[PDB]
């Protein structure tokens, strides 16, 4: 069961925060090698000097690909699985899968890195956002009561009516920098940046396609008239 996330690719601030998160917490193991710092800065509206100073940690040039020092073979040996390139991961898995996966890490002592993932069971990835999210465990917490889709909210306060459930992801209190909403926004910005990286031509594609479709409707009108006429 995945969680839906509404990703706004026109939000430059969110994409900038996601790029910062990717460059700091993700490019340690994951490359974005099919994507250049120059294009990322141009599309996110980041000044080239600012991109150089804030997001390029590897000594690469602005026009260089987002390569990292960790080789796939070395990382496969170290982690048991090679950390895949994340340029297209939004297209490979989808944004909802990424949103649910980056928020589904929970402590699991039986695992090599002490964590497991609801979305990606037995994943070889360490929980690298634990400092932000905090300790997440499979425990008992309050979950909204649902009966055959009959979802109960509080009529007055508008907040959910909840009952206790003991197989839920619960963040141990005062264990991470960000609360649930703040970590949700952090993961949303990161997944928004990954969605941009997978499909950097999306907005331009929509604009160009709108113009193309308008032209094709015009041309269709003319061709239809030239056909129906001349078929009399």
């Amino acid at each position: 069961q995945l969680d839906h996330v509404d990703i706004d690719l026109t939000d430059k601030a969110a994409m900038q925060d996601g790029a910062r998160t990717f460059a700091n917490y993700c490019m340690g193991c994951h490359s974005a090698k099919f994507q250049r710092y120059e294009r990322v800065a141009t599309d996110l509206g980041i000044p080239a000097d600012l991109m150089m100073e804030k997001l390029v940690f590897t000594g690469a040039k602005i026009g260089d690909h987002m390569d990292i020092g960790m080789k796939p073979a070395d990382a496969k040996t170290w982690f048991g699985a090679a950390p895949p390139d994340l340029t297209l991961v939004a297209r490979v898995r989808g944004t909802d899968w990424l949103y649910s996966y980056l928020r589904s890490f929970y402590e699991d002592p039986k695992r090599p890195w002490g964590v497991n993932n609801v979305i990606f069971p037995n994943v070889g990835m360490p929980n690298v956002l634990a400092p932000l999210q905090g300790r997440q465990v499979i425990g008992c917490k309050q979950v909204q009561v649902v009966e055959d889709g009959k979802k109960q909210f509080d009529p007055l306060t508008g907040t959910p009516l909840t009952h206790e459930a003991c197989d839920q992801l619960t963040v141990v209190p005062k264990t991470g920098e960000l609360n649930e909403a703040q970590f949700d926004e952090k993961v949303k910005n990161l997944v928004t940046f990954l969605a941009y990286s997978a499909n950097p031509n999306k907005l331009a594609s929509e604009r160009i396609g709108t113009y193309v479709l308008l032209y094709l409707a015009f041309f269709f009108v003319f061709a239809y008239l030239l056909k129906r006429e001349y078929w009399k």
Partner: peptide
């Protein structure tokens, strides 16, 4: 605004 948004996570305390 962008610079604050893009601040690196790792902070290093330096002499002087």
């Amino acid at each position: 605004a962008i610079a604050k948004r893009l601040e690196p996570v790792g902070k290093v305390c330096v002499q002087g």
